[PDB]
Amino acid sequence: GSSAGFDRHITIFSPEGRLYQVEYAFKAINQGGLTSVAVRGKDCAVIVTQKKVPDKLLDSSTVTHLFKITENIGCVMTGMTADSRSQVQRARYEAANWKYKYGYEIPVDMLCKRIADISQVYTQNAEMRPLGCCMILIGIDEEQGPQVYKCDPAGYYCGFKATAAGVKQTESTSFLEKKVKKDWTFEQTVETAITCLSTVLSIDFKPSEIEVGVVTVENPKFRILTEAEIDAHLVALAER
Amino acid sequence: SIGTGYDLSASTFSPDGRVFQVEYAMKAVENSSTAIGIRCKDGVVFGVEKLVLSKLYEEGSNKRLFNVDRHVGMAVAGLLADARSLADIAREEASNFRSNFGYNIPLKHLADRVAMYVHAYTLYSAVRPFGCSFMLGSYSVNDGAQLYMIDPSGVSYGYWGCAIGKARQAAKTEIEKLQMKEMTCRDIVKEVAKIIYIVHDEVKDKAFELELSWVGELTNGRHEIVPKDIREEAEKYAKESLK
Amino acid sequence: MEYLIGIQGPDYVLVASDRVAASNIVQMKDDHDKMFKMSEKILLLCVGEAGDTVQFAEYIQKNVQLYKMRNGYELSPTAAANFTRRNLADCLRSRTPYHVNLLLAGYDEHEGPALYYMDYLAALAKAPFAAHGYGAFLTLSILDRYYTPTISRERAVELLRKCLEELQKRFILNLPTFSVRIIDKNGIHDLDNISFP
Amino acid sequence: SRRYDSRTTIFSPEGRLYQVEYAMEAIGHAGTCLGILANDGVLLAAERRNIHKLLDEVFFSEKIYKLNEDMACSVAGITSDANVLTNELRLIAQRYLLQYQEPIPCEQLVTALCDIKQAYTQFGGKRPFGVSLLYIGWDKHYGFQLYQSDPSGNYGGWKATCIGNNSAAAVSMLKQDYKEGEMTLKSALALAIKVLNKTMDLSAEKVEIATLTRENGKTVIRVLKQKEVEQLIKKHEEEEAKAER
Amino acid sequence: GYSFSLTTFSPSGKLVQIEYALAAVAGGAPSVGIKAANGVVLATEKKQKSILYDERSVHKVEPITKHIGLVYSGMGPDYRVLVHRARKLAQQYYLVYQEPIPTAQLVQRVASVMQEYTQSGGVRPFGVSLLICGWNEGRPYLFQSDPSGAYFAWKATAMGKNYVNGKTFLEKRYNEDLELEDAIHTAILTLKESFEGQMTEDNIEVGICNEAGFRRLTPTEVKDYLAAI
Amino acid sequence: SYDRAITVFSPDGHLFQVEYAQEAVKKGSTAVGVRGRDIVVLGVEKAKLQDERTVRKICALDDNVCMAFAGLTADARIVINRARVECQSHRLTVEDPVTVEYITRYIASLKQRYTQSNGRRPFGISALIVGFDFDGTPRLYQTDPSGTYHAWKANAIGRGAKSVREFLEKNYTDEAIETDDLTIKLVIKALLEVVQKNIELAVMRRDQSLKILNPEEIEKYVAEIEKEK
Amino acid sequence: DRGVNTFSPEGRLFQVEYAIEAIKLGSTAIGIQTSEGVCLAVEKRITSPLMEPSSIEKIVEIDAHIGCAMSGLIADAKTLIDKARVETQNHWFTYNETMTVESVTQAVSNLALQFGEEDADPGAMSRPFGVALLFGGVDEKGPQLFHMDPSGTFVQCDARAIGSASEGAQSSLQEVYHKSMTLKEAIKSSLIILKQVMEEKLNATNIELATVQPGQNFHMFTKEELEEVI
Amino acid sequence: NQYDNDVTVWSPQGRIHQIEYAMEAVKQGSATVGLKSKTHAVLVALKRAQSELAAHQKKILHVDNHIGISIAGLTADARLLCNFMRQECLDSRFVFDRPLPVSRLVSLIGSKTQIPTQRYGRRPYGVGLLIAGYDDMGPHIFQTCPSANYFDCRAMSIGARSQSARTYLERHMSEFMECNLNELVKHGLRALRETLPAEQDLTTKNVSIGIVGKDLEFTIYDDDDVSPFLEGLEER
Ligand code: NA
């Protein structure tokens, strides 16, 4: 794992063909302390993350990692919070701009490819640093059904059956692949995402400790779940 | 502080995924005089421990409270010239909203816009992050009372109570004692002064001057300074409580 | 209004131009030279609008001179005519078009004598003989009548004299003196001015 | 930012441009490429370095580039850098032709590219082009010409020159067997194969020759075919064997 | 921005950032190109880290225009930049000449962009090598463009992890007169030389180019090629 | 654009890039200039396979002015061409041709600017500018990477400028400025003190053009130098 | 490396500090302001008999009533001299009058910290000017002599010396200067002090002398005039 | 060591050393004093000479009819800032036909001088000013510094040995508002004096005064103009 010149300071190749500054941006995602899970069902797509509000002095409704990009597209950001807000503003811009030029709402994959391409620029130009954050987008495609996409500070992007980001990403993915190996209803999809975050963080959740976001084939508008709606899922999982 | 080149630019991450230039800029706020803001049932109130650097200065020099818009107020902590440059940005942001949409900029929206001008200075070797943290307060019938805070990183959160500076944590454990959600701006002013006097270090620091401002139903949603009458009454209670 | 003429022989180019510099109804100058030596074997005869002529001709002259200094050899009459053409045509659709009408005479060691015609629009034509100005309407037919490609220089001067005499008899403009010059294997030779006293 | 700046356009304490000198080093690693001027024409002989069995051979050449109706060139160095420079050479030749309606005289085309190469050494903060060129041509002023230019933007006219791998050895070998004014394309082609044989570690697949001649008042540029080149190396092999006997 | 080059000549005469970009390519998943008599094949390893990935969502074998196709070894996000640029360049040619761009012409235009990132200020070279296939003037074409901006016309070649072995395999295994059907079987076999795991129609990707233009093979088409071992 | 200060002051008050540009001048071929009464002679120091015409270091800028150089040849070409353009642009603006001082002041101004503007290194050349003014006075000047310029009776620049200057200081007499051939002999004798077909001389007599003598003509003077000793 | 606009821990820009050190390498020049006019004198510092002494012009005329003495990098001075001459003629054009000595000195002075790298014009200065100037001239305020250095700081002087032997020449000036001394005595003191500080002996070729007095225009002393002074 | 080079670099202490180095320029200049009464604003400065033969540098410059300044630091930066102030004042009278309110001018100085403190390759202004003005809020004394921070002052002193002037201004602070012009100028002259070594006293050569107030436009007194004021001070 060698270094030569300014390969650990700027986005220029290392002797092994690596981009150390991009590698460091992945470590910045974990600096936030949070973990996020996203699962794709038969007729739905859910996103879930931790909701750490340590002082009662905060206004709990302003503390969020879930965002509405468009009416039918939502996202869960993981990493450096301001870097995350910046990416959400750009995602919103690119999406509104797309409908303006093309007369149709941006596909989930196109918005993910777009944000990923913007992120790649930072990976090639030295005068700026990558964003220390991970974006996961959900939405219902008119012809392809539910979609779950994620993009990296590296500029990579992909579609997923289920995905994770943050501190316990490795463990969350290990868990998510074990359940997908062994029918994905809306309840089955919500319960899986909640119990992935819970078993991986070893925390039996309270309704204020997590935030759930969902898109449904019946109602494709990105919906963020209430504490009561979150509790109805939490209690039904405990019944089992 | 990792002194190996990884901390000289905001376009450079350290191996553990940190941007030290932003952290060093946050340390300028950590060395600053404390500013506090409290959101209550009918408005938002600001109070600042404005340390008196010289007996030669005028009463009210170096105001750490600004009017960003007719309904928005700003309480700063950190490098004052950066703080005042952010006041001008926020002012122009509010001015541009009215020119675009014909009505007063919603506080959450102003906080979001200004926090992204702050964020922008945390990505490049070409520019320096702002060595400043600030709060925005507002009150309207439609939106209610709103208090937000932005840090050198560009993060913007909504608050019921907030403190920034040297005594950031000490002020917070005192603000936590108050049940603001059920209080008025006439009652909460007395408490803001009490908290600022408690948090002040008479030994390590020299004399200080208390700056008090508010925006609420009592002011018709306009950001104003607390009149001399009410300020003297709150300072009298703050000194009497200390004993 | 002004007059330019060229007659190319087998091994030379004969050129002549009026000597009048006139403003309004007055003849300000009787001894005005309208030919600009570009090279040792190239002359650019230029007429047209008030300022445009000296401005355009001198720009080309200094650029042909810069070529000589830069490369050690001169432009050929063909390259110098096409370079004149490129600049004139490039200004045509610009804010500042040049109203200049010209003839480029020259002698090349490889291609021999060449005479070119160019109007203000920058159309370039190689002609055995040419004329610019209202005078060309009275003299192109005299040249059509008597010009032959084997015309000796002595004969071409009698032909040029027949054209200049025609302008005295029929042209309403007073053009009494003309500059006469021959370009050949040995360069530009000044001949006696054809005068009408 | 000052920290990350390479300082590519600055002088060293002894009045040296290090980037220009390090670009020369790159050219020494590139294939050997020679040029020989003769009375009836001028030639270019270069070592092919794309010499693998699975290569397709879509183009007429590898190192030989036609620039003009009357001019061609060969390169030694960074091939992508050489593509930029040869493409610019073609644009300069057409800008001259459009303006004067005569083809660009050989030395003028070389100077124009050398002025771009020189600019890369004096300003901009960019690295130079890692290429040396050998130009062959014909013009109405100096006839058959052979030029050479390097990354410094310096150029010169030559009767025989070499650039690339073992350039130094080839110039000493060319210096000894070259006969000023008495050279013909036939004898110079024999000399080209004699030199490349010693400066390489040779078959028609490993070499690539091109000639510039004057046929009926028009210039003829032609890269020689494998069977032509094969006969020229077979002929050398015969004279070399009959030298010991 | 940073107006100075980030790729400079080392004292030995090497453009070290280009050498380091080639290392990124040599560590990428393997890719193969084979020029058959009546077509061209492009094959790659599309093996993802977990079952959770949706393989159908992103592609390694991409179309440029109707008759040109593309594949790579190296940095995935860098590749996407060159794909967009290549598709744009192919439209600029078609708009002017009203004729499908010759493959040599596309490859030279794409290779010039790659050279740009080795000299232009404040940028690093692309960490990718492309394998460009096409069909024009009734014949197939196979090119490779590397991070320096240099291009090569190949009859058959390998890139990425275990390319030295794949190239020796290709040289000995097949030559000219191969039919496109045969060549796809060869491309799959050269991928099998350095394939850790069971090969499926989801962890490999193939694209073909013939008289009918370029197109990516469907997983059902790849499945029938894998049925023949 | 590249906004970086290249030439700056060092703690001892030096402009190091200009002194490094003077070290590049010191490595160039020796150039001698002698100012006569009705003539001005410039001479330079000198491969068998090279074309002598393409490597000449005496250049005519215009009919009245011509110059010689020492240092970076590619740098010198850019200065020589910018001066050639300024001679014609001067005749276009003013009506009169350039005075030997005007173009020297011009070249010097260009040189100075490259020592004080961003992203540029100084020109690694010195020049000896000879000619006659419109009044007919013979003038010899000298410029250097800094931008400073002065007039001279005789001067030398390049590899061995110190020893040729020492010779010319002791040998520039009114007897040597008497006949045109004695002025030419001073230049050849001065160059013979550093160089060993190794000289290139150019002469300018009052109204006639710059005459570049041939090698046989040079050998005519070289033979008489050995005889007079 | 550090930026050209970097401050030293003492509060001075390093580039300006070093530009002042460059002046310590330049030829020594003296100026004396008298009721009867200002005198300017400078050593040419000739390095070869082959060099034309006339081609060294260290005393220049800015306008008919203003002269300039320079020291340091004489190529850097040539740019500021032209800027001064252009300034006087633009003022003459706009206002139909002459400039005061101070106004000209201030104009040249405004170009001093106009150097930099980032955020500057496409043809901006990278470094300061390594020159010191003495502006001696006459206006309505009488004879005036001004000093200027690379920091843009200009001051009015009764007597000033700049260059290699600045310390010594100023010491000598201080002991002999009186506010009511004649211009004849001012020239003599300058020529004596200049003779003292030079390595080479004083000659009519070796030095430059010039005066500006009411009722006369900036005068550059000829060899014949300099011989009768020496 | 590493955090000294550029203004965009924050030290691990949350400090910007380039800003602190620029402020050292103010501290190296000669002392200047500014003070105000209920009707007037006074500026006094010890002009310092480079030798007996050289003159004492101009320490006080005109900005507008109602505003005048005294400088301490880089004289070229002081002239850049003076022309910005003069121009901002011209704009206000051109547009509004009313003098630019002194506190507003000072905000513009704080705003424009902050810009370089946050851009790479840029440097702070190496000058600090004392501003004397008069408007609808009476007389004012302001202080600007390389930091881009500014202060509204009752009295003030910047430069070398200025801390000595500050103690006189703090001790006599109470008398300033009810002071007449002669007495207010005396308070300033006396604070200026305390800076100068016990070796030297104020002189008609090395003293500069600037006065603005209720009926007087900004006026600069320099040599025999200074004499009336100095004709009362004579102890220590
Ligand atoms: Na980057």
UniProtKB/Swiss-Prot annotation, chain B:
Aminoacyl-tRNA synthetase is among the record's keywords: no
Domain of life of the native organism? Eukaryota
Question: N6-acetyllysine modification sites?
Answer: 55, 204, 228
Claim: Ligase is one of the keywords in the record? no
Q: Which UniProt keywords apply?
A: Acetylation, Cytoplasm, Host-virus interaction, Nucleus, Phosphoprotein, Proteasome
Regions that span the bilayer: none
Q: Coiled-coil ranges per the record?
A: none
Q: Name one GO biological process term.
A: proteasome-mediated ubiquitin-dependent protein catabolic process
Query: Which positions does the record annotate as the modified residue Phosphoserine?
Result: 241
Enumerate the InterPro entries for this protein: Ntn_hydrolases_N, Proteasome_alpha, Proteasome_alpha-type, Proteasome_asu_N, Proteasome_sua/b
Gene3D superfamilies reported for this sequence: Glutamine Phosphoribosylpyrophosphate, subunit 1, domain 1
Pfam families per UniProt:
Proteasome, Proteasome_A_N
Q: What does the UniProt induction comment state?
A: Down-regulated by antioxidants BO-653 and probucol. Up-regulated by bacterial lipopolysaccharides (LPS) and TNF.
Instruction: Tell me where in or outside the cell this protein is found.
Output: Cytoplasm; Nucleus
Q: Which GO terms describe its cellular component?
A: cytoplasm; cytosol; extracellular exosome; nucleoplasm; nucleus; proteasome complex; proteasome core complex; proteasome core complex, alpha-subunit complex
Q: Which GO terms describe its molecular function?
A: ubiquitin protein ligase binding
- Subunit text: The 26S proteasome consists of a 20S proteasome core and two 19S regulatory subunits. The 20S proteasome core is a barrel-shaped complex made of 28 subunits that are arranged in four stacked rings. The two outer rings are each formed by seven alpha subunits, and the two inner rings are formed by seven beta subunits. The proteolytic activity is exerted by three beta-subunits PSMB5, PSMB6 and PSMB7. Interacts with AURKB. Interacts with CDKN1A. Interacts with MDM2 and RB1. Interacts with the C-terminus of TBXA2R isoform 2. Interacts with DNAJB2.
Curated annotation (Swiss-Prot), chain E:
Q: Which residues carry this modification: Phosphoserine?
A: 3, 10, 12
Induction statement: Down-regulated by antioxidants BO-653 and probucol. Down-regulated in response to enterovirus 71 (EV71) infection (at protein level).
* SMART domains for the chain: Proteasome_A_N
Alphabetical UniProt keywords:
Acetylation, Cytoplasm, Nucleus, Phosphoprotein, Proteasome
Major site of localization recorded for this protein:
cytoplasm
Q: Which InterPro entries match?
A: Ntn_hydrolases_N, Proteasome_alpha, Proteasome_alpha-type, Proteasome_asu_N, Proteasome_sua/b
Say if the entry is tagged with keyword Nucleotide-binding: no
Choose one Gene Ontology CC annotation of this protein and give it: secretory granule lumen
| Source domain of life | Eukaryota
Question: What biological processes does GO assign it?
Answer: proteasome-mediated ubiquitin-dependent protein catabolic process; response to virus
Subcellular localization is given as:
Cytoplasm; Nucleus
Gene3D superfamilies tied to this protein: Glutamine Phosphoribosylpyrophosphate, subunit 1, domain 1
UniProt modified residues of type Phosphotyrosine: 2, 20, 72, 117
Post-translational modification, briefly?
Phosphorylated on tyrosine residues; which may be important for nuclear import.
Q: Which residues carry this modification: N6-acetyllysine?
A: 66, 167
| Family of the protein in this entry | Belongs to the peptidase T1A family.
Functionally, this protein is described as follows: Component of the 20S core proteasome complex involved in the proteolytic degradation of most intracellular proteins. This complex plays numerous essential roles within the cell by associating with different regulatory particles. Associated with two 19S regulatory particles, forms the 26S proteasome and thus participates in the ATP-dependent degradation of ubiquitinated proteins.
**Name of the protein described by the UniProt record:** Proteasome subunit alpha type-2
| Source species of the chain | Homo sapiens
Lineage runs: Eukaryota, Metazoa, Chordata, Craniata, Vertebrata
UniProtKB/Swiss-Prot annotation, chain F:
- Cite the CDD domains for this sequence: proteasome_alpha_type_7
InterPro entries per UniProt: Ntn_hydrolases_N, Proteasome_alpha, Proteasome_alpha-type, Proteasome_asu_N, Proteasome_sua/b
For this UniProt entry, the molecular function terms from Gene Ontology, in alphabetical order, are:
identical protein binding
Q: Which residues are recorded as modified (Phosphotyrosine)?
A: 149
Q: Name one GO biological process term.
A: proteasome-mediated ubiquitin-dependent protein catabolic process
Compartment(s): Cytoplasm; Nucleus
Q: Which PROSITE patterns match?
A: PROTEASOME_ALPHA_1 (PS00388), PROTEASOME_ALPHA_2 (PS51475)
Similarity annotation: Belongs to the peptidase T1A family.
Specify the protein name. Answer: Proteasome subunit alpha type-7
The coding gene here is PSMA7
Curated annotation (Swiss-Prot), chain G:
Q: Where on the chain is Phosphothreonine found, per UniProt?
A: 47
UniProt KW Nucleus keyword: yes
- Glycosylation site residues: 190
Does the record bear Coiled coil in its keywords?
no
Q: Which residues carry this modification: Phosphoserine?
A: 8, 48, 55
Record Pfam families: Proteasome, Proteasome_A_N
* Listed CDD domains: proteasome_alpha_type_5 (cd03753)
**Which tissues is this chain's protein expressed in?**
Expressed in fetal brain (at protein level).
Expression induction per the record is: Up-regulated in colon cancer cell lines. Up-regulated in fetal Down syndrome (DS) brain (at protein level). May be the target of the transcriptional activator NFE2L2.
Q: Name its cellular compartments.
A: Cytoplasm; Nucleus
InterPro entries referenced in this protein's UniProt entry, alphabetically: Ntn_hydrolases_N, Proteasome_alpha, Proteasome_alpha-type, Proteasome_alpha_type_5, Proteasome_asu_N, Proteasome_sua/b
Can you supply one Gene Ontology CC term for this chain's record? secretory granule lumen
* Record keywords: Acetylation, Cytoplasm, Glycoprotein, Nucleus, Phosphoprotein, Proteasome
Q: Which GO terms describe its biological process?
A: proteasome-mediated ubiquitin-dependent protein catabolic process
- Subunit field text: The 26S proteasome consists of a 20S proteasome core and two 19S regulatory subunits. The 20S proteasome core is a barrel-shaped complex made of 28 subunits that are arranged in four stacked rings. The two outer rings are each formed by seven alpha subunits, and the two inner rings are formed by seven beta subunits. The proteolytic activity is exerted by three beta-subunits PSMB5, PSMB6 and PSMB7. PSMA5 interacts directly with the PSMG1-PSMG2 heterodimer which promotes 20S proteasome assembly.
Annotated family? Belongs to the peptidase T1A family.
- Name the record gives this protein: Proteasome subunit alpha type-5
User: From which source organism is this entry?
Assistant: Homo sapiens
